[PDB]
Write a protein that binds this ligand. Structure first.
Ligand SMILES: *[C@@H]1O[C@H](CO)[C@@H](O[C@@H]2O[C@H](CO)[C@@H](O[C@@H]3O[C@H](CO[C@H]4O[C@H](CO)[C@@H](O)[C@H](O)[C@@H]4O)[C@@H](O)[C@H](O[C@H]4O[C@H](CO)[C@@H](O)[C@H](O)[C@@H]4O)[C@@H]3O)[C@H](O)[C@H]2NC(C)=O)[C@H](O)[C@H]1NC(C)=O
Ligand SMILES: *[C@@H]1O[C@H](CO)[C@@H](O[C@@H]2O[C@H](CO)[C@@H](O)[C@H](O)[C@H]2NC(C)=O)[C@H](O)[C@H]1NC(C)=O
Ligand SMILES: *[C@@H]1O[C@H](CO)[C@@H](O)[C@H](O)[C@H]1NC(C)=O
Ligand SMILES: *[C@@H]1O[C@H](CO)[C@@H](O)[C@H](O)[C@H]1NC(C)=O
Ligand SMILES: [Mn+2]
Length: 743
């Protein structure tokens, strides 16, 4: 009935006034930490050692500027992020005087700052969060090496920054936008400063701050119980941002207040979110929504956390090892200078070496996984990068994920939630019915990364004679589209109901079939009835896609445009026997696509290489823009994606009122695929594939049923009970302090 696991290996330690360190470990545990660094955590200690040796080799490049105009001129999370790694190094290797002196210098440069806000982001506290949590961690880690002056002066800096963060929690979106990455980030910085002040006897301020952090976070964790698939609606990259602070919260609040969250249902599914979103080769992730090529923070820290405290079977350590060993050193996917060392110290503290690295049993078997809250299907994740080991992904779901969408729309948690005002979906993309395809582990159709929220920056459709007048000429896309130059009045109403849906998803005898429905992402006034997308993976190097657009009889649409992206390589035109197509050149050969509507006509595509506006952190993207005339009421188009190993020799498509047939002959096999117009819940199948001699039926079994998840019972009481846990800790500290004044 509860989200507690009493067996978790985090002892509730009772507080001791003016004892340091205390945050993550005590002084008596340092000796074991040093033993670990030399014996069983050597591979993590070595990452810390190389980070610090890098800083020591160029100290003036890495030290925060004394000059406040230089300190605050740029996004400056690198200061606090790198300080955490440096401070942990000084704990493990106290005999390195040069590193301890650099850490003192580093902290002095930060403590001299009049402000930890970035110059032209006055209303954004995240840079203050990074500086504060790193500074306060270093303060705790290094307390006994500091002078008395530094011990006092640095404490005042922590109190000032923490007090400012507390005051802004009542005046900013992050104080009430639950499960948005800003909220655990800013909360954790406040809690860390609060624990440092609590330990030093400043109980009046630390009580207010602690009570405020727990109230916000405990509410979000109750809401998080409804996310049944372990995912986060902001994607893998921003999700790693969230979990960096969420996992710190769960650890610290248990160690210091005995608030136990380690039986949480979302937490025990979360491994799937990092195991099933990783592409062949363990370097990249599916990169849905605002994302880089993989993760923002960690994820080795979060993975060893899951193994020590949740799974206790060695597959978290195993996945962390795969990612650690395959990380890119230069070029796309390289972790940024600002984020790359941020979680090294918690990875060191949370790694349990007694759980030997053991892969999940299905490792090496291409597996289909459906995230029923996120609305994302993936296939072939976490494979070795090999010929015929392919990745496939598809997204069609509810804005915010099912839990957030349903909470808002059925008015759940009335005491806490008053609509979308309590959630923040600004990092999502107009991307429903999008897909990606990485045959042989070579990215072919990819996501375009962090960028402007334009529909055509995702692998989806736009439609041609818009009723409204937006940007994008007469083209209209999905209802979450934003020109970010003008937001329409009351269009938020239709954006607030954006919704795709995965209708079917099954793997059967090496063939994958996925159907999605995208009507719910487009304005109802275009009288679209069905925006249907069908994926059929006939072979690891042969993917067939069929779109079916059913127009209502009123609708004014005349044309559709489908977009297909590759973020790293531009597309080149091609045509064979009147079949238009595109290809990209990769080192292992050419990857090709060909298309035609079901009358046999294929139009030549338009090609574009786009940068991104100044302020986004990645170059841009390249896409094909395939247009098709909307034939009659029902229109259907087939696209075919080929890896270099396969030689397609016929590609014919013929259909009628109820059926469409796609025939594909290669030099080694023949493939037929039959799809039917209408829905198939109850009276016939979705698709039938005839490979060489095998008959493959995708019937009502592959259908995906929808569920409401029930409101957590007694949700207000859950939060209230947990808020009682920290009061006796404050009371005991007070008694210890009074005990000492008397003596
Ligand atoms: C460490 O702990 C993590 C976290 O729980 C595990 O992660 C899971 O890994 C598996 C794949 O290895 C994921 O897939 C699921 O596996 C289940 C199998 O579990 C074991 O027990 C069954 C018997 O109950 C054995 O037959 C099997 O060999 C396994 O040893 C399946 O039951 C799941 O679904 C199956 O049934 C459904 C319904 O019929 C089908 O649709 C599926 O196709 C499948 O047949 C599923 O396959 C699982 O999702 C992972 N969980 C999470 C949360 O990520 C690690 O595997 C574990 N590592 C080690 C070393 O044990
Ligand atoms: C995708 O390609 C289509 C066709 O080339 C583009 O549509 C044309 O855009 C121009 C300029 O915006 C208009 O003058 C034409 O009238 C459009 N044609 C039709 C049939 O509507 C479209 O702009 C492209 N979209 C993107 C995002 O690249
Ligand atoms: C903290 O803020 C107060 C003003 O509220 C200021 O007087 C004091 O000097 C500040 N201390 C530090 C170390 O920044
Ligand atoms: C594009 O990305 C490359 C790295 O792959 C980088 O070197 C280059 O500077 C980027 N383009 C621009 C205009 O900065
Ligand atoms: Mn996208």
């Amino acid at each position: 009935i509860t989200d507690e696991n009493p067996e978790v290996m985090i002892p509730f330690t009772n507080a001791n006034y003016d004892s340091h360190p205390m945050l993550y470990f005590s002084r008596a545990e340092v000796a074991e930490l040093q033993l670990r660094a030399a014996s069983s955590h050597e591979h993590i200690a070595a990452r810390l050692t190389e980070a610090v040796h890098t800083m020591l080799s160029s100290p003036l490049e890495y030290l925060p500027p004394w000059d406040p105009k230089d300190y605050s001129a740029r996004w400056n999370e690198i200061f606090g992020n790198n300080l955490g790694a440096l401070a942990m190094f000084c704990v493990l290797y106290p005999e390195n005087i040069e590193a301890r002196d650099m850490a003192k210098d580093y902290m002095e440069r930060m403590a001299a700052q009049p402000s930890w806000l970035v110059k032209d982001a006055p209303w954004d506290e995240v840079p203050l969060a990074h500086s504060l949590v790193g500074f306060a961690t270093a303060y705790d880690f290094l307390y006994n090496y500091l002078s008395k002056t530094q011990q006092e002066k640095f404490l005042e800096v922590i109190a000032n920054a923490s007090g400012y963060m507390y005051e802004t929690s009542y005046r900013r979106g992050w104080g009430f936008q639950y499960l948005h990455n800003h909220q655990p980030t800013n909360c954790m910085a406040l809690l860390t400063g609060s624990l440092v002040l609590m330990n030093q006897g400043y109980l009046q301020e630390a009580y207010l701050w602690t009570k405020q952090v727990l109230t916000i976070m405990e509410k979000s964790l109750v809401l998080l119980r409804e996310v049944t698939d372990g995912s986060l609606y902001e994607g893998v990259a921003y999700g790693s941002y969230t979990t960096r602070s969420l996992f710190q919260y769960m650890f610290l609040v248990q160690r210091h207040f005995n608030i136990n969250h380690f039986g949480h249902p979302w937490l025990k599914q979360h491994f799937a979110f990092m195991y099933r979103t990783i592409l062949p080769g363990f370097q990249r992730t599916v990169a849905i929504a605002d994302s880089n090529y993989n993760w923002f923070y960690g994820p080795e820290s979060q993975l060893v956390f899951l193994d020590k405290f949740v799974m206790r079977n060695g597959s978290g350590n195993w996945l962390a090892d795969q990612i650690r060993r395959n990380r890119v050193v230069e070029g796309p996917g390289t972790p940024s200078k600002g984020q790359r060392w941020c979680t090294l110290h918690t990875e060191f503290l949370w790694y349990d070496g007694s759980l030997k690295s053991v892969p999940p049993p299905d490792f090496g078997t291409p597996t289909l996984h459906y995230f029923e809250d996120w609305g994302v299907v993936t296939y072939g994740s976490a494979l070795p990068a090999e010929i015929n080991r392919s990745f496939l992904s598809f997204k069609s779901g509810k804005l915010g994920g099912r839990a957030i969408y349903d909470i808002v729309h059925r008015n759940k948690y009335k005491d806490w939630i008053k609509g979308w005002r309590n959630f923040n979906a600004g990092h999502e993309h107009p991307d429903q019915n999008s897909f990606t395809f990485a045959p042989n582990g070579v990215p072919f159709i990819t996501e375009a990364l962090y960028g402007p929220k334009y529909t055509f920056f995702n692998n989806v459709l736009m439609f041609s004679p818009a009723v409204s007048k937006s940007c994008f000429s007469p083209w209209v896309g999905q209802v979450t589209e934003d020109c970010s130059s003008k937001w329409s009045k009351y269009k938020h109403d239709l954006a607030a109901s954006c919704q795709g849906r995965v209708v079917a998803a099954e793997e059967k005898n090496g063939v994958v079939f996925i159907r999605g429905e995208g009507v719910g992402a487009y304005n109802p006034q275009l009288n679209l009835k069905n925006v249907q997308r069908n994926l059929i993976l006939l072979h690891p190097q042969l993917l067939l896609l069929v779109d079916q657009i059913h127009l209502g009889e009123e609708s004014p649409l005349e044309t559709a445009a489908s977009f297909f992206h590759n973020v790293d390589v531009p597309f080149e035109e091609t045509v064979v026997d009147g079949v238009h197509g595109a290809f990209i050149r990769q080192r292992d050969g050419l990857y090709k696509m060909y298309w035609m509507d079901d009358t046999g006509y294929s139009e030549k595509a338009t090609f574009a290489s786009v940068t991104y506006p100044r302020g986004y952190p990645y170059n841009g993207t390249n896409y094909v823009n395939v247009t098709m005339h909307l034939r009659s009421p029902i229109t259907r188009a087939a696209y075919l994606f080929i890896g270099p190993s396969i030689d397609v020799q016929s590609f014919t498509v013929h259909g009628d009122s109820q059926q469409l047939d796609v025939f594909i002959a290669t030099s080694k096999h023949a493939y037929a695929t039959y799809l039917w117009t209408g829905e198939a819940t109850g009276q016939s199948a979705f698709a039938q594939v005839i490979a060489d001699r095998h008959k493959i039926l995708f019937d009502r079994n592959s259908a995906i049923k929808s569920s409401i998840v029930p409101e957590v019972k007694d949700y207000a009481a859950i939060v209230e009970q947990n808020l009682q846990h920290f009061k006796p800790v404050f009371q005991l500290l007070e008694k210890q302090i009074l005990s000492r004044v008397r003596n």
